[PDB]
Scaffold this active site. Structure first.
Site, PDB file in Angstrom:
ATOM      1  N   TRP A   1       0.822  -1.205   0.000  1.00  0.00           N
ATOM      2  CA  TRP A   1       0.000   0.000   0.000  1.00  0.00           C
ATOM      3  C   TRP A   1       0.862   1.265   0.000  1.00  0.00           C
ATOM      4  CZ3 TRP A   1      -2.147   2.635   4.880  1.00  0.00           C
ATOM      5  CH2 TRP A   1      -3.066   3.643   4.537  1.00  0.00           C
TER       6      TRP A   1
ATOM      7  N   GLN B   1       4.633   5.500  -4.390  1.00  0.00           N
ATOM      8  CA  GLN B   1       5.643   6.305  -3.701  1.00  0.00           C
ATOM      9  C   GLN B   1       7.098   5.929  -3.994  1.00  0.00           C
ATOM     10  OE1 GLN B   1       5.713   5.699   0.571  1.00  0.00           O
ATOM     11  NE2 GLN B   1       6.780   7.646   0.938  1.00  0.00           N
TER      12      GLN B   1
ATOM     13  N   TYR C   1      -4.787  -0.504  -4.897  1.00  0.00           N
ATOM     14  CA  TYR C   1      -3.494   0.161  -4.698  1.00  0.00           C
ATOM     15  C   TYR C   1      -2.881   0.713  -5.974  1.00  0.00           C
ATOM     16  CZ  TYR C   1      -3.490  -2.131  -0.102  1.00  0.00           C
ATOM     17  OH  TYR C   1      -3.809  -2.598   1.148  1.00  0.00           O
TER      18      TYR C   1
ATOM     19  N   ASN D   1     -11.991  -6.404   0.694  1.00  0.00           N
ATOM     20  CA  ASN D   1     -11.276  -5.253   1.264  1.00  0.00           C
ATOM     21  C   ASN D   1     -12.046  -4.512   2.360  1.00  0.00           C
ATOM     22  OD1 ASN D   1      -9.218  -3.240   1.561  1.00  0.00           O
ATOM     23  ND2 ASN D   1      -8.799  -3.346  -0.634  1.00  0.00           N
TER      24      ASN D   1
ATOM     25  N   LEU E   1       2.547   0.591  12.564  1.00  0.00           N
ATOM     26  CA  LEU E   1       3.145   1.843  13.010  1.00  0.00           C
ATOM     27  C   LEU E   1       2.159   2.992  12.830  1.00  0.00           C
ATOM     28  CD1 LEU E   1       6.758   1.564  11.541  1.00  0.00           C
ATOM     29  CD2 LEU E   1       5.949   0.983  13.841  1.00  0.00           C
TER      30      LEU E   1
ATOM     31  N   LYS F   1       8.421  10.144  14.156  1.00  0.00           N
ATOM     32  CA  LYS F   1       9.046  11.176  13.340  1.00  0.00           C
ATOM     33  C   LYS F   1       8.163  12.393  13.103  1.00  0.00           C
ATOM     34  CE  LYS F   1       8.034   8.859   8.944  1.00  0.00           C
ATOM     35  NZ  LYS F   1       8.771   8.281   7.789  1.00  0.00           N
TER      36      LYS F   1
HETATM   37  N1  LIG Z   1      -6.850  -4.422   4.901  1.00  0.00           N
HETATM   38  C1  LIG Z   1      -6.695  -3.082   4.937  1.00  0.00           C
HETATM   39  O1  LIG Z   1      -7.640  -2.297   4.853  1.00  0.00           O
HETATM   40  C2  LIG Z   1      -5.292  -2.533   5.099  1.00  0.00           C
HETATM   41  C3  LIG Z   1      -4.158  -3.291   4.794  1.00  0.00           C
HETATM   42  N2  LIG Z   1      -2.887  -2.751   4.961  1.00  0.00           N
HETATM   43  C4  LIG Z   1      -1.728  -3.634   4.619  1.00  0.00           C
HETATM   44  O2  LIG Z   1      -0.744  -3.477   5.622  1.00  0.00           O
HETATM   45  C5  LIG Z   1       0.513  -3.073   5.032  1.00  0.00           C
HETATM   46  C6  LIG Z   1       1.261  -2.220   6.008  1.00  0.00           C
HETATM   47  O3  LIG Z   1       0.521  -1.030   6.350  1.00  0.00           O
HETATM   48  P1  LIG Z   1       1.256   0.385   6.482  1.00  0.00           P
HETATM   49  O4  LIG Z   1       0.243   1.379   6.934  1.00  0.00           O
HETATM   50  O5  LIG Z   1       2.029   0.711   5.258  1.00  0.00           O
HETATM   51  O6  LIG Z   1       2.227   0.197   7.701  1.00  0.00           O
HETATM   52  P2  LIG Z   1       2.869   1.018   8.939  1.00  0.00           P
HETATM   53  O7  LIG Z   1       1.772   1.554   9.779  1.00  0.00           O
HETATM   54  O8  LIG Z   1       3.926   0.199   9.564  1.00  0.00           O
HETATM   55  O9  LIG Z   1       3.484   2.258   8.153  1.00  0.00           O
HETATM   56  C7  LIG Z   1       4.567   2.000   7.233  1.00  0.00           C
HETATM   57  C8  LIG Z   1       4.986   3.328   6.691  1.00  0.00           C
HETATM   58  O10 LIG Z   1       5.547   4.107   7.820  1.00  0.00           O
HETATM   59  C9  LIG Z   1       6.872   4.568   7.516  1.00  0.00           C
HETATM   60  N3  LIG Z   1       7.896   3.746   8.231  1.00  0.00           N
HETATM   61  C10 LIG Z   1       8.044   2.361   8.230  1.00  0.00           C
HETATM   62  N4  LIG Z   1       9.044   1.933   8.963  1.00  0.00           N
HETATM   63  C11 LIG Z   1       9.585   3.070   9.472  1.00  0.00           C
HETATM   64  C12 LIG Z   1      10.691   3.284  10.342  1.00  0.00           C
HETATM   65  N5  LIG Z   1      11.413   2.260  10.817  1.00  0.00           N
HETATM   66  N6  LIG Z   1      10.992   4.582  10.678  1.00  0.00           N
HETATM   67  C13 LIG Z   1      10.249   5.615  10.189  1.00  0.00           C
HETATM   68  N7  LIG Z   1       9.174   5.520   9.355  1.00  0.00           N
HETATM   69  C14 LIG Z   1       8.898   4.205   9.037  1.00  0.00           C
HETATM   70  C15 LIG Z   1       6.940   4.526   6.006  1.00  0.00           C
HETATM   71  O11 LIG Z   1       6.353   5.686   5.430  1.00  0.00           O
HETATM   72  P3  LIG Z   1       7.111   7.048   5.028  1.00  0.00           P
HETATM   73  O12 LIG Z   1       8.585   6.700   4.915  1.00  0.00           O
HETATM   74  O13 LIG Z   1       6.528   7.515   3.713  1.00  0.00           O
HETATM   75  O14 LIG Z   1       6.808   7.915   6.228  1.00  0.00           O
HETATM   76  C16 LIG Z   1       6.104   3.298   5.651  1.00  0.00           C
HETATM   77  O15 LIG Z   1       5.539   3.344   4.368  1.00  0.00           O
HETATM   78  C17 LIG Z   1       0.083  -2.415   3.715  1.00  0.00           C
HETATM   79  O16 LIG Z   1       1.104  -2.261   2.772  1.00  0.00           O
HETATM   80  C18 LIG Z   1      -1.069  -3.312   3.279  1.00  0.00           C
HETATM   81  O17 LIG Z   1      -0.525  -4.445   2.616  1.00  0.00           O
HETATM   82  C19 LIG Z   1      -2.722  -1.430   5.439  1.00  0.00           C
HETATM   83  C20 LIG Z   1      -3.832  -0.658   5.746  1.00  0.00           C
HETATM   84  C21 LIG Z   1      -5.128  -1.196   5.584  1.00  0.00           C
HETATM   85  C1  LIG Z   2      -9.395   5.405  -0.947  1.00  0.00           C
HETATM   86  C2  LIG Z   2     -10.399   4.319  -0.701  1.00  0.00           C
HETATM   87  C3  LIG Z   2     -10.673   3.887  -2.085  1.00  0.00           C
HETATM   88  C4  LIG Z   2     -11.852   4.434  -2.760  1.00  0.00           C
HETATM   89  C5  LIG Z   2     -12.801   5.000  -2.033  1.00  0.00           C
HETATM   90  O1  LIG Z   2     -13.800   5.276  -2.610  1.00  0.00           O
HETATM   91  C6  LIG Z   2     -12.632   5.234  -0.756  1.00  0.00           C
HETATM   92  C7  LIG Z   2     -11.576   4.970  -0.027  1.00  0.00           C
HETATM   93  C8  LIG Z   2     -11.515   5.245   1.287  1.00  0.00           C
HETATM   94  C9  LIG Z   2     -10.995   4.151   2.173  1.00  0.00           C
HETATM   95  C10 LIG Z   2      -9.767   3.450   1.600  1.00  0.00           C
HETATM   96  C11 LIG Z   2      -9.912   3.142   0.134  1.00  0.00           C
HETATM   97  C12 LIG Z   2      -8.627   2.340  -0.353  1.00  0.00           C
HETATM   98  O2  LIG Z   2      -7.915   2.580  -1.388  1.00  0.00           O
HETATM   99  C13 LIG Z   2      -8.241   1.146   0.411  1.00  0.00           C
HETATM  100  C14 LIG Z   2      -7.958   1.546   1.776  1.00  0.00           C
HETATM  101  C15 LIG Z   2      -6.794   2.566   1.745  1.00  0.00           C
HETATM  102  C16 LIG Z   2      -9.134   2.228   2.336  1.00  0.00           C
HETATM  103  C17 LIG Z   2      -8.850   2.255   3.797  1.00  0.00           C
HETATM  104  C18 LIG Z   2      -8.026   1.070   4.055  1.00  0.00           C
HETATM  105  C19 LIG Z   2      -7.695   0.425   2.762  1.00  0.00           C
HETATM  106  O3  LIG Z   2      -8.698  -0.545   2.817  1.00  0.00           O
HETATM  107  C20 LIG Z   2      -6.361  -0.314   2.528  1.00  0.00           C
HETATM  108  O4  LIG Z   2      -6.436  -1.363   2.172  1.00  0.00           O
HETATM  109  C21 LIG Z   2      -4.989   0.290   2.712  1.00  0.00           C
HETATM  110  O5  LIG Z   2      -4.035  -0.749   2.536  1.00  0.00           O
END
Ligand SMILES: NC(=O)C1=CN([C@@H]2O[C@H](COP(=O)(O)OP(=O)(O)OC[C@H]3O[C@@H](n4cnc5c(N)ncnc54)[C@H](OP(=O)(O)O)[C@@H]3O)[C@@H](O)[C@H]2O)C=CC1
Ligand SMILES: C[C@]12C=CC(=O)C=C1CC[C@@H]1[C@@H]2C(=O)C[C@@]2(C)[C@H]1CC[C@]2(O)/C(O)=C/O
Ligand SMILES: NC(=O)C1=CN([C@@H]2O[C@H](COP(=O)(O)OP(=O)(O)OC[C@H]3O[C@@H](n4cnc5c(N)ncnc54)[C@H](OP(=O)(O)O)[C@@H]3O)[C@@H](O)[C@H]2O)C=CC1
Ligand SMILES: NC(=O)C1=CN([C@@H]2O[C@H](COP(=O)(O)OP(=O)(O)OC[C@H]3O[C@@H](n4cnc5c(N)ncnc54)[C@H](OP(=O)(O)O)[C@@H]3O)[C@@H](O)[C@H]2O)C=CC1
Ligand SMILES: NC(=O)C1=CN([C@@H]2O[C@H](COP(=O)(O)OP(=O)(O)OC[C@H]3O[C@@H](n4cnc5c(N)ncnc54)[C@H](OP(=O)(O)O)[C@@H]3O)[C@@H](O)[C@H]2O)C=CC1
Ligand SMILES: C[C@]12C=CC(=O)C=C1CC[C@@H]1[C@@H]2C(=O)C[C@@]2(C)[C@H]1CC[C@]2(O)/C(O)=C/O
Ligand SMILES: C[C@]12C=CC(=O)C=C1CC[C@@H]1[C@@H]2C(=O)C[C@@]2(C)[C@H]1CC[C@]2(O)/C(O)=C/O
Ligand SMILES: C[C@]12C=CC(=O)C=C1CC[C@@H]1[C@@H]2C(=O)C[C@@]2(C)[C@H]1CC[C@]2(O)/C(O)=C/O
Lengths: 327, 327, 327, 327
Positions: free
Chosen positions: D23, D29, D56, D124, D212, D220
Site C-alpha cells: 500500500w 511512492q 493500490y 477489502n 506503526l 518522526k
Molecule cells: N486491509 C486493509 O484495509 C489494510 C491493509 N494494509 C496492509 O498493511 C501493510 C502495512 O501497512 P502500512 O500502513 O504501510 O504500515 P505502517 O503503519 O507500519 O506504516 C509504514 C509506513 O511508515 C513509515 N515507516 C516504516 N518503517 C519506518 C521506520 N522504521 N521509521 C520511520 N518511518 C517508518 C513509512 O512511510 P514514510 O517513509 O513515507 O513515512 C512506511 O511506508 C500495507 O502495505 C497493506 O498491505 C494497510 C492498511 C489497511
Molecule cells: C481510498 C479508498 C478507495 C476508494 C474510495 O472510494 C474510498 C476509499 C476510502 C478508504 C480506503 C480506500 C482504499 O484505497 C483502500 C484503503 C486505503 C481504504 C482504507 C483502508 C484500505 O482498505 C487499505 O487497504 C490500505 O491498505
C-alpha cells in the site's frame, strides 16, 4: 483360491495383488535402464499398480516412472499410478497437507510424471498443522479437477482415517479409499487388527509396504551389512542402525528359523514373507521393492507359495515370530 | 393420437419415438457408405436419437457414427447421441463402472465420436464390483464436466435403478434418467410391469432395444438360418443357437400366427412388432437396427400401423403370444 | 429521491433504472449503424443494462450487440448484459428449458455475442415439458461454469418462481434473482401486486419490459397505423390487431386523457408512461425500446418527470386508467 | 519462545510472523527498483507473505509485485500472495462484493500479478449492498476455480465474519479463514478482544495492518510533518490531519514516553511497536510497510525485541497508552 486382481478396499478400482514401488531405487539407487526393465517385467507379469511420491529422490523417481510409461507407450487406462504428497520442498509452505501444498504438490508431481492424473493420491503422513476438513476438501477438489481418481492416507491411525470419513460425510465431500501401511512379519498389529475394522465399517482398503522390511526379511543381513545393500547406501544409516540394533539381531535369529520353513516349502525366504503378506484377503495389494531383476522375479514368484501356506504353516510362523497380535 | 416426439421419462429431453442403433452394423456388418445412407434416412424422417457403445466393433461403431455426423454437418443441437460404457479394453481396469473407467471410457468414446459430449451416457450393464455411490458420483462428475447431458442405466433391475436414485438423493448427486431395456413380443415383463413403476415413482424413462429380437421377429428364420442374416455372422453363434433351440422354434410358430394379423392389417410382421412396442406411452423410444435401406424404410413404416392397433388386435396378439405379464 | 442505480432485487448487481433492449430493432428493424448510435447514447447517459435473446432476429440481435461492444471497446466490467433462452432453432431439441438446450443455447448466444459470459441468463418463458429441478440445476451449472453471473425467469407465475426457489433450497442449487415481466399502464397486476411479495419473501427483483406497450402508449396510433411503425412491420400483424381491436381503441381513448396530464407536467406521453413505470422502488429497471435517436433521448428524459409524479398525479392517472389492481 | 512461522488461524497455511505490504509504496511512492530491493530483503529474511489490493495505485502495485516475482523467479509454492477486492473501477459495477465484481476483480488482479491464483483473496471491506450468501458463494466459486486457495475478510465486524461462517455452514460453502485488521498501540480493542473469540469459535486468524499507524508510531512526527513523509504525500491529507489533530498530538506525547522504554531495551520505537504487535499468539502475522531499505531492516529487527517484552514492560506500556481494552 487366490484372485490375482482384486478391488482396492470397497471401490471399483481393480489392482494386482502385487505392485511395484519406486522408493530408493527409481531416479536414485538404480539406473533408468534398470528401472525400465523392472517396470516392464512387472507389467508383463500382470502388475498394474505402481507407487511413487513427490519426495522420492527429490522428484526424480516420478520423472523416471513417467519416462518409462511414455517410452513403453502402455495405455494409461491399463495402469494404476499412485503418488504420495507431503514433502515437496524446503520452503515452509512446500510441505504438509494444507490445501495449498496438496494442490501445488500434486500439480508438480503430475508435471514430472507427464500425466494428467494419478489413480490414487495419498497423504504421505498425517499433518498435525492442518485441520482434517481442509485436507479432505482439498483432496476432494483435486479429484473433482480430474487430477486424481481417488485419494487415500498413509501412516494414519484408524481414528484419523475415520475422522477423514466423518468430515466427508458431514460436508458431503469424498471419503478416502485406501491406507498405505507398513506390513511384514515384524510389523503386524495395524494391518491385521485395525485395518480390517475400517474395511468393514467404511470400506477403506489396505495397500501395504516394505514387505521385506526394506530387505531385512530377505535374510542377507544374517552376518553384517552386505556391500551395496540398501542398509549401506548413503542416507540410510537409520536402516543400518536398526539392523545392528539388539532387536535387529533378534529378528535375524527368527529369520534363520523361518528359513527352515522356506526350504521345507521349496521357496526362498523373501517368497515366503511376501506370500505371507498376501495370505489374508484383508490386504488388497503388497507394494514390492527391487534393485535388480533377479530380486523382482524372485519376489513375483511368491504367488506360487501362497497355496502352500496351510493353517499349520501359519501357526508355525507365528510360534517363531511370537508377535501374533491380539484380536 | 401418436406424438412422434416425446420426453425421455420425466426429463426435458425430447426424443423421436424411433431411434437408430449401431450395434453389429456400424463399423462392422455394413460399410460406412451404407451406414451414412441409413443415418441420413433416419435423420431425414425425423429421427434424432442415435445409440452406440464403446464396445461395438471395438470402438469402430463410434468412429463411423462420428464421421457421418461430421460429414453431413448436422447441427449438434438437433441430435441426441447416446453411448454406453462398460467394456472398454482387455486390461483389468478397462472394464466396469468404476470412476476410473467411467471417466476414461467416456473420454475415449468422445474422442472416437469427435464429439465434446453425448446427450446420454449409459452404464451398459450393472457392475457387482463397484459400489453404487462411486458409480453415481462418477456419472455426476462427467455430467458436471460437460461430457454428457444426462446418464442412464441398461439391463439394471428396478431395485438397482432405485438404489442409484437413493444414492443421488442422499449425497445430492444427479439421478439417472433412463433405462435402456430389451423389449419385443418375447420379452415383456420388465418394460410392461416394472419400468412403469419407476416412471411414476422417480421419473425414469424407458428406451427399448432389439424390437425384432435381433431379426427373429421379422420371421425370416421360419425355415432355417438365411445366408448373411445376423444369426449367420461370425461371433453370433449364440443367436443361431437361440433360433435353432426348442423355444426358438416355438417362437417361429407364433410368428406364423402373427403374420396372419399383419396381412389382415396391411403391414409386414416387423412393422406390426415395432408398432406393437410403441403402443403404450410407457416407452419413450424404440431403438431400431437395420443392415440395409429396405429394412429401415420398412421399419419406419411401423408408425402408420399404430392407429390400427385396437384393443381387439392387442388381445389377439396376447392370445397368440400367451405371455402377457401379470400386473 | 430517485437513485439512478439500484440493486437488482436482493443481489449485489447494480443496474441503471433504465436499460436498453434489442427486440425487433437490433439486427432487424434498424441498421447496425443506428444500433451503434443508440447503444452509445444509452451508455453515455449512464445506462449499463442491455437485454437480448437467442430468438431475436434469429440470433442477429446478439451478433449486433456483441459487435458494438467490441467496436466501442467498453470495459466488460462496466456492462450488465442479459440474454434469454428458449427458442433456439427449428429442431425439436433446440427449444425449451432442458439441460441440453440451456447449455447449448447459452453457449451459442455467447459465441454470437463474442462474450465469455452474460451477467444474467433468463428462461424466456416457462417450459411445461421440463421438470423444475432439471432447469434449476442447468442454470446453476452454467453459472458455475462461468457462462453467466446470475439467472432469472421471464413470464413465470409467482408460484413457478417460488418453485424454482424451493428446488434451489432443497438441493442446494442457485436461486433465481430476477423476473423480467411486462409492465405499463395497461398491464399492472403482476408487477404491482405479485412481484413485491417475491421481493420480500425470496429477494427476487423485477426488470420490466415494453414500458410503452410496444409503442402504443406513445399515442401515435391515435388515428390508425402510422407508416413504418412497429405495428406495420412484417411479422407484427398481432400488434396491429391489438391496436385495431375494440380494447385497443379504448386504450387510445384513455391515452388522450393522459396526454392532457403530460402537457400539464411539461413532458411527453412516453416520458410520463416511463416515469410512471419507475415511480415505485419495486421495479429495479425498465427496459427501453427505440427505433431512432429522437425516441431514445425522449425516453431517457422520463427521469426528469419522476419528481413531478405526486400522489395526486398518480391518483388522477389511476382514475383515467381505471385498472388499479387490488391489494 | 517465538515461532517465526505459524498457521494462519486454524488453517494449514504457514505464514511468516512478519509480512510485507504494498500500500502507498509499490507502483506509487517508491520506484520499482526500490520495490524489488525491499521484497528481496524480505524474502531473504524468511518473509513469505506479501499483501496487495486491486485498488493500490489503481492496479500498479499488483503489476510491480508480479514483475518482481517473475524477475526474481522464486518458486510460487514458496510464496503466500494475498490481494484484496472491492474498489476496481469507476463504473457502478466495478466495486463491491457482488459475484460479478469478485470474479471480474480477482480475474483482473491475477492478470496484473501474472499469477494463476493468490493464496488468499480478501474482501477489502464489507458491502452493505450485497447479501452475505452471494459474497460467500462467489468467494467459494473462485477458490473452486483455482483462482485462490483461501478467502478472508477485512474491516468486517466479528458479527459479520460469523455471518459469513453461518452462510458457509448452512449452504455447505467455504468458510472465511482470516480477518485483516488494523492493529497498533492506538487501535487495540478489535484484535485483542474480539478476534480471539473468532479464533477459538470458528478458527479465523488475524493478519494485522498498519503496525506503526502509517508511520506515526515511528515518532518522526514529533515536531511536525517531515518532508516526504507519508503524511506529506499527495492524496494523504487525511493522515496529516490526524497527525495535526488534537488526539494526534496526544499520541506523540505518549510516544515520547514509549521512546524512553525503547532506549531502555536497546531498540528503536518502531521495533518496540512492531514487537509489541507480535507479543500475543492471537496475531498470526503483522504486515509491514516501508519506503526504503533502512526502515525495512529496522522493522525486521523487531523480532529481537520480542524476548525483552516482559509482563513488566507490557504493563508499563499499558500505563502509558492508558487504552488497555476491557475483557
Ligand atoms: N486491509 C486493509 O484495509 C489494510 C491493509 N494494509 C496492509 O498493511 C501493510 C502495512 O501497512 P502500512 O500502513 O504501510 O504500515 P505502517 O503503519 O507500519 O506504516 C509504514 C509506513 O511508515 C513509515 N515507516 C516504516 N518503517 C519506518 C521506520 N522504521 N521509521 C520511520 N518511518 C517508518 C513509512 O512511510 P514514510 O517513509 O513515507 O513515512 C512506511 O511506508 C500495507 O502495505 C497493506 O498491505 C494497510 C492498511 C489497511
Ligand atoms: C481510498 C479508498 C478507495 C476508494 C474510495 O472510494 C474510498 C476509499 C476510502 C478508504 C480506503 C480506500 C482504499 O484505497 C483502500 C484503503 C486505503 C481504504 C482504507 C483502508 C484500505 O482498505 C487499505 O487497504 C490500505 O491498505
Ligand atoms: N507409504 C509409505 O510411507 C511407504 C511406502 N512404500 C512403498 O512400498 C514400496 C516397497 O517398499 P520397500 O521398502 O522398497 O520394500 P521391501 O521391504 O520389500 O524392500 C525391497 C528392497 O529389499 C531388497 N530386496 C528385494 N527383494 C529382494 C530379494 N529377493 N533378495 C534380497 N534382497 C531383496 C532390495 O534392496 P537392496 O538390493 O538395495 O538391499 C529392495 O530395494 C516402495 O517402493 C514404496 O512405493 C515403502 C515404505 C513406506
Ligand atoms: N443396452 C443394450 O444392452 C442393448 C442396446 N441395443 C441397441 O438397440 C439397437 C437395436 O437393436 P437390434 O438388436 O439391432 O434390433 P432388432 O431386434 O430390431 O434387430 C435388427 C436387425 O434385424 C434385422 N432386420 C431389421 N429390420 C428388418 C426387416 N424389416 N426385415 C428383416 N430383417 C430385419 C437386421 O439384421 P440382419 O439383416 O443382419 O438379419 C437388423 O440388423 C442397437 O443397435 C443398439 O443401439 C441392442 C441390444 C442391447
Ligand atoms: N422477457 C420478455 O418476454 C420481453 C422482453 N422485452 C425486452 O424489453 C425491451 C423493450 O421492449 P419494447 O416492447 O421494445 O418497448 P416499448 O414498449 O417501450 O416499445 C418501444 C418501441 O415503441 C416505439 N417508441 C419508443 N419510444 C417512442 C417514442 N418516444 N415515441 C414514439 N414511439 C416510440 C418504437 O417502435 P416504432 O418506432 O417501430 O413504432 C420502439 O421500438 C426489449 O427490447 C427487450 O429487451 C420486451 C418484450 C418481452
Ligand atoms: C526422509 C523423510 C523426508 C523428509 C523428512 O523431513 C523426514 C523424513 C523422515 C521420514 C520419511 C521421509 C520420506 O522421504 C518418506 C518416507 C521415506 C518417510 C518414511 C516413510 C516414507 O513415508 C516413504 O514413503 C518411503 O517410501
Ligand atoms: C460381448 C459382450 C462384451 C464382452 C463380454 O465380455 C461379454 C459380452 C457379453 C454380453 C454382451 C457384450 C457386448 O458387447 C454388449 C452387449 C452385446 C452385451 C449384451 C447386450 C449388449 O449390452 C449390447 O449393448 C448390444 O447392443
Ligand atoms: C415469436 C415467439 C417465438 C417462437 C414461437 O414459437 C412463438 C413465439 C410467440 C411468443 C414470442 C416468441 C419470441 O420471439 C419471444 C417473444 C417475442 C415472445 C413473446 C415475448 C418474447 O418473449 C420477447 O422476448 C420479446 O422481447
Amino acid at each position: 483360491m487366490l484372485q490375482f486382481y482384486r478391488n482396492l478396499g470397497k471401490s471399483g478400482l481393480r489392482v494386482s495383488c502385487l505392485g511395484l514401488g519406486t522408493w530408493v531405487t527409481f531416479g536414485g539407487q538404480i539406473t533408468d535402464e534398470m528401472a525400465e526393465h523392472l517396470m516392464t517385467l512387472a507389467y508383463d507379469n500382470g502388475i498394474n499398480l505402481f507407487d511413487t511420491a513427490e519426495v522420492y529422490a527429490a522428484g526424480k523417481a516420478e520423472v523416471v516412472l513417467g519416462n518409462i510409461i511414455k517410452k513403453k507407450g502402455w495405455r494409461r487406462s491399463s495402469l494404476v499410478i499412485t503418488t504420495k504428497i507431503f514433502w515437496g520442498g524446503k520452503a515452509e509452505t512446500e510441505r504438509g497437507l494444507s490445501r495449498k501444498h496438496i494442490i501445488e504438490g500434486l500439480k508438480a508431481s503430475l508435471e514430472r510424471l507427464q500425466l494428467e492424473y494419478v489413480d490414487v493420491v495419498f497423504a504421505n503422513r498425517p499433518d498435525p498443522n492442518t485441520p482434517m476438513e481442509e485436507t479432505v476438501r482439498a483432496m476432494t477438489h483435486v479429484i473433482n479437477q480430474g487430477m486424481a481418481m481417488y485419494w487415500g492416507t498413509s501412516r494414519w491411525s484408524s481414528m484419523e482415517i475415520m475422522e477423514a470419513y466423518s468430515v466427508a460425510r458431514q460436508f458431503n465431500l469424498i471419503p478416502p479409499r485406501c491406507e498405505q501401511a507398513e506390513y511384514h512379519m515384524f510389523q503386524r498389529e495395524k494391518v491385521e487388527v485395525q485395518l480390517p475394522e475400517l474395511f468393514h465399517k467404511i470400506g477403506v482398503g489396505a495397500m501395504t509396504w516394505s514387505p521385506l522390511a526394506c530387505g531385512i526379511v530377505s535374510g542377507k543381513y544374517d552376518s553384517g551389512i552386505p556391500p551395496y545393500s540398501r542398509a549401506s547406501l548413503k542416507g540410510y544409516q537409520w536402516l543400518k542402525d536398526k539392523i545392528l540394533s539388539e532387536e535387529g539381531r533378534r529378528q535375524q535369529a527368527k529369520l534363520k528359523e523361518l528359513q527352515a520353513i522356506a526350504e521345507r516349502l521349496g521357496c526362498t525366504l523373501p517368497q515366503l514373507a511376501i506370500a505371507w503378506c498376501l495370505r489374508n484377503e484383508g490386504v488388497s495389494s503388497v507394494l514390492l521393492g527391487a534393485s535388480n531383476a533377479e530380486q523382482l522375479m524372485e519376489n513375483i514368484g511368491a504367488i506360487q507359495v501362497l497355496p502352500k501356506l496351510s493353517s499349520s504353516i501359519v501357526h508355525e510362523i507365528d510360534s517363531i515370530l511370537g508377535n501374533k497380535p491380539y484380536s
